[PDB]
Amino acid sequence: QLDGPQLAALAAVVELGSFDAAAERLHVTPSAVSQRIKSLEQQVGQVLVVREKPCRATTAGIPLLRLAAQTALLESEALAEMKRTRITIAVNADSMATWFSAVFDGLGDVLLDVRIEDQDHSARLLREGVAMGAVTTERNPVPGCRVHPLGEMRYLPVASRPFVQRHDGFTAAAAAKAPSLAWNPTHFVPTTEGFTAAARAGLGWGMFPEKLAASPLADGSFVRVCDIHLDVPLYWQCWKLDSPIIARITDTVRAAASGLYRG
Amino acid sequence: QLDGPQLAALAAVVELGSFDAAAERLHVTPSAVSQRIKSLEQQVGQVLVVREKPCRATTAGIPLLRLAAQTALLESEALAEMGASLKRTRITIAVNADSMATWFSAVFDGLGDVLLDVRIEDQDHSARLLREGVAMGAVTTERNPVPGCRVHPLGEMRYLPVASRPFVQRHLSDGFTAAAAAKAPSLAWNRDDGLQDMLVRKAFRRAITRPTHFVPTTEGFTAAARAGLGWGMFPEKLAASPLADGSFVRVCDIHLDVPLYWQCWKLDSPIIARITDTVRAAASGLYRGQ
Amino acid sequence: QLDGPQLAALAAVVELGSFDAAAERLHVTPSAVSQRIKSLEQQVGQVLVVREKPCRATTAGIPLLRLAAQTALLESEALAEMKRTRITIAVNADSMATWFSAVFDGLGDVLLDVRIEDQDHSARLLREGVAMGAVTTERNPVPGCRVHPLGEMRYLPVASRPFVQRHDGFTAAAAAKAPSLAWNPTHFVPTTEGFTAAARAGLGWGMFPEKLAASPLADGSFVRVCDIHLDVPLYWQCWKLDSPIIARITDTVRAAASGLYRG
Amino acid sequence: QLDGPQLAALAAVVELGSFDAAAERLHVTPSAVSQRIKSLEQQVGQVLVVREKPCRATTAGIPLLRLAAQTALLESEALAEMGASLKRTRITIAVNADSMATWFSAVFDGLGDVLLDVRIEDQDHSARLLREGVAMGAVTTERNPVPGCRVHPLGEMRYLPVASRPFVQRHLSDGFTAAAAAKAPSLAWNRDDGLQDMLVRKAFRRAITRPTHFVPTTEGFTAAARAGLGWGMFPEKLAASPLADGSFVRVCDIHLDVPLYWQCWKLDSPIIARITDTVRAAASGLYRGQ
């Protein structure tokens, strides 16, 4: 490889007729491009540019001007390949079920690729460069990622009115003597509309996001087992790169998470 | 010769991914587990377990995996027809996302006395869990009987192509043309989701590539649509409400009927038949179709 | 689990009317099945068979007869799933290109699944239980496999007449000063008809199986570089299970390899 | 900003699967390689390399992988248009199995002065190697231009459905009926081989499941057919001989024409154009088709 500051400097001094303008185009200095050029000529055993101003290419430097040109033509179309911008994001289920959807209001002008994943899989999607960022419970930066705290999600204990009197008071004896809902005397019932439907059906008691368990408790369809609550910090982790798109989304997500508890 | 606690060994070694693990799980030495799987590999003439890293079934070990589990259920019932009173049996069933959010919910209400393990899986994922004995039944879009399984029709689920009014204004002011449909953003659960594609085909006898968002889950897919991101196919039970609200509007007059089926272990089982009755009844509200 | 010798013994004493015949069907002994039965009844808290001959099942043993029955019905259809027999085999390229094809004469009555793989991939196919056996250069038994020596394949050095006088005599100085053919001053050219076509085209010199390099040397299209030869032992490795199908194929392959050199 | 020896870093880290390796390969510290890939990840705004176990390109790093290699060839030519005389350039090209056994062979005869690295790959495998800069050209059944690639038609290859006379006697005595074709064993290179399936379709406007052997490679597939295992589709150039021999006979009157294409790096290159001329001329013997 012979690239690449020395080439752009060569094309510059050749296309614009001067060392000054070259500088002007590369945000460098007249003397800084001069020796930038003399290097390149050194390592090819000939003189590429002719000092006389306006300075055009010497015959033996044409191919290198051609190189600079086709190189640059390639780079362009490459950058294109990699219209609507695609952003792939990972989110944990309770977040998609709860606060994350706000983000959709800010994002109708791009093309989302949303994945519902847990801590471990989010991390993989990050590392493997398929997910640009993840809502996750992991606090330690994933390789190549920056970590933004989002606050905490709060979970309550819940069952139905009937499930209470069946398993009196919270007879703290009925620890396992009570049937319990879960995700992955315990029934496993994913989604959200059924993990909810299970509990509503006096089928068990479970940990529900406060925000989800909100309405039914007011309806009276739900009752709190007890006044214990568990608090899980969420984090936005994304690629530690400076990019307008990464920043936009980090910002949208942080704002859709405003109503979470203080971390 | 015809098997035994040899299957037990297999199923344990695969579900637990270790020879040592499944040994301190059935009260026996690695050697025993090894000869047990070996003797079974001998009888059947096939290698059944990849021994490496985490232990998994080979292709040929899938059917005996299932065999082990149908046998385990058959066994615990034959020995409860002898003694129930209490018995809390573990039942695993696969269910497609769209069914769980709509009709399937009802199955819990009429359930007992059994411990439920429900998996949200698409057509392909669920057929695997059936083959592998992991699930003793599944709501699937699959009409063809998977191995070791009876097929029950449940009815058809109708899918309406919908979106919010703002979305229609911005993208379908002039209606659902093939010039408009090539530009309006569509939704989808993921790449394997063909629902939107069958419309468009049905609607334009063709196939139109468009901008398409991928948003999974009921809440996820629902917020996307509610948030005017794009149009998408929704189980009618789920659109019924936003159609009243004004929150959703039908993008066009066409729809999709998708036959559902309840596939479960072909065998005798008071627990199976009972679950089947419940699943079938929970679906009495589908469109009759066929 | 309660299975499974005790059940078959129960069904036996129940279906046939006697302990004798039971024995007769299970290749066991009258007294050996008697206590085989009393165990099973012990661990279910009731009497399953009635001593009186011919002995039928007791009411409380019917379900266990049913169990034995449905169990067995399942096993059958399972065994089926796992018409024409499918046999998947791995072979190294130079073997498929050379001696292995003889095997096809003995095998038109089954359905072959032939994979062309090297030592490492063969081994994986074996371990992962997809290939029943592999022709391979590996001598150490793969996990779960038995090893059959097959003999040695012999490779010669070759180029074209022109390639000689271009790279006098084997001026042992032109070690790298000569262009060479290879697989994975060296051109990489797989298949067999082209790895051959390359050399024929004075494009390089390479190691060819003696059997392949046979004809052209007689044609005069090929010449030997020198009289060095390299010898590679081949091995048939397959599942260490006793099975009629495994034995058939181990035998066919060993015979198709008869004309290899003494190992 | 616009890249540089940053690509060099990438391509090295991916082709070698290690940050340390590619460092002791370009004379620089891990850190340098790291910042170099980082600065490039920065400029482009994407993660480009999975750092783990063996280092591989991410999807978004594929195009820069190609970029690195087209640049590397462009560079070594621009600097040989300055100085050749000797130069032995490494060129990698993909070629489908059926082309290598028939017409492509000719390309070596009219070749120089260049070091050849030929890969036998099917349609899909070869398009990958083109995208990834691994191959600077490929004979493929793919008409659509892969990214960074010009497409040249080469002609069409004809495929005859054939078998040995013993095979016909035993299985096709009464000819190539859909009742006979459902029973006679067919061949195939593997599951993705659709050649035999397109016949049968062409022959019976339908699709018939049959016993089918899978035997890859030219010698492998050829011995199978010669050994009466089954019927299969053969490049005519290859059947021409056994049709004379009597060794093969056409199973039926139908055939398949498959358009071939030569896809190569879209750019200027005396080496590319030259290779292209040779490939194109080696194929002058295909059927003109189109």
Rg of chain C (C-alpha set): 30
Domain with CATH 3.40.190.290 in chain D: 84-288
Domain with CATH 1.10.10.10 in chain D: 1-83
- Identify any residues that bridge with C112 across adjacent strands, giving them in sequence order: C87
Token duo for residue B261: 């089926």
Rg of chain D (C-alpha set): 23
SS3 of C212-235:
HHHHHHHHCCCEECCCCCEEEEEE
Q: Is D104's Cβ below 8 Å from some Cβ in C?
A: yes
Find all residues with CB under 8 Å of B42, minimum gap 6, and list them.
C241, C242, C243
Q: Is D211's Cβ below 8 Å from some Cβ in C?
A: yes
In chain A, which residues have their Cβ closer than 8 Å to the Cβ of B224? 101, 104, 112
B188 closest CA partner among B162, B206, B215, B165: B215
D286 closest CA partner among D264, D257, D266: D257
C261 closest CA partner among C207, C216, C211, C218: C211
Q: Do the Cβ atoms of D12 and D49 come closer than 8 Å?
A: no
Q: Which of A104, A189, A191 sits opposite B229 (nearest CB)?
A: A104
Distance CA D263, CA B174 (A): 42
In chain C, which residues have their Cβ closer than 8 Å to the Cβ of D218? 191-193
Contacts within 8 Å (CB) and 24+ apart, A62-69: A63/D78, A63/D79, A63/D81, A63/D82, A64/A7, A64/A10, A64/A40, A64/D78, A64/D82, A65/A10, A65/A11, A65/A14, A66/D78, A66/D268, A67/A7, A67/D74, A67/D75, A67/D78, A68/A7, A68/A8, A68/A10, A68/A11, A69/A11
CATH hierarchy code of domain C72-263: 3.40.190.290
Token duo for residue A147: 């970590």
CATH hierarchy code of domain C1-71: 1.10.10.10
Q: Which of C74, C128, C129 sits opposite B267 (nearest CB)?
A: C74
| Interface contact C78-B64, CB threshold 8 A | yes
3-state secondary structure of A115: strand
C-contacting chains (≥3 CB pairs under 8 Å): B, D
- Identify any residues that bridge with D162 across adjacent strands, giving them in sequence order: D232, D250
Is chain C in touch with chain B: ≥3 Cβ pairs within 8 A? yes
Selected residue of A66, A71, A86, A132 to mutate for chain D interface (largest D Cβ count, 10 A): A71
C254 closest CA partner among C230, C231, C238, C242: C238
> Which 8-state DSSP code applies to residue A261?
B
A2 closest CA partner among D147, D83, D13, D148: D83
3-state secondary structure of A187: strand
Q: Do the Cβ atoms of B111 and B278 come closer than 8 Å?
A: yes
| Interface contact C144-B267, CB threshold 8 A | no
Token duo for residue A225: 């087992």
Residues B262/B266/B268/B271 CA torsion (nearest 10 deg)? -30
Q: Do the Cβ atoms of B136 and B264 come closer than 8 Å?
A: yes
Q: How far is B10 from chain A (nearest CA, A)?
A: 23
Q: Which residue of C has its CA nearest to B74?
A: C67
Distance CA B240, CA B243 (A): 5
Distance CA A100, CA C206 (A): 63
Question: DSSP string covering B211-253, please?
Answer: -B-B--SHHHHHHHHHTTS-BEEEEHHHHHHHHHHSS-EESSS
In chain A, which residues have their Cβ closer than 8 Å to the Cβ of D3? 3-4, 75
Find all residues with CB under 8 Å of A25, minimum gap 6, and list them.
A12, A16
Selected residue of C83, C88, C95, C96 to mutate for chain D interface (largest D Cβ count, 10 A): C96
Distance CA B242, CA B232 (A): 13
Angle, vertex CA A193, rays to CA A191 and CA A198, nearest 5: 90
Question: DSSP string covering D99-160, please?
Answer: HHHTTGGGGGTT--SEEEEEEE--HHHHHHHHHTTS-SEEEES--SPPTTEEEEEEEEEEEE
CB neighbourhood size of A238 (10 A): 25
Q: Do the Cβ atoms of A49 and A61 come closer than 8 Å?
A: yes
| Interface contact C191-D218, CB threshold 8 A | yes
Token duo for residue D190: 């593997």
H or E element in which residue D194 lies: none
Distance CA D106, CA D120 (A): 16
Task: Indicate the fold that domain D1-83 takes in CATH.
Answer: Arc Repressor Mutant, subunit A (1.10.10)
Burial A34-63 (b: 16+ CB within 10 A, else e): bebbeebbeebeeebbeeeeebebeeebbb
What residue has token string 């295909």?
D286
Size of interface A-D (CB pairs under 8 A): 99
Q: Do the Cβ atoms of A73 and A13 come closer than 8 Å?
A: no
D32 closest CA partner among D24, D41, D23: D23
| Interface contact D119-C190, CB threshold 8 A | yes
The count of residues in chain C is 263
| Phi, psi angles (nearest 5°) of residue D287 | -80, 140
Find all residues with CB under 8 Å of C140, minimum gap 6, and list them.
C147
Domain with CATH 3.40.190.290 in chain A: 72-263
> Which 8-state DSSP code applies to residue D201?
H
CATH hierarchy code of domain D84-288: 3.40.190.290
| Phi, psi angles (nearest 5°) of residue A24 | -50, -30
Q: For residue A192, what are the CA distances in angstroms to A198, B102, D255?
A: 10, 12, 56
Burial D242-264 (b: 16+ CB within 10 A, else e): bbeeeebbbbbebebebbbbbbb
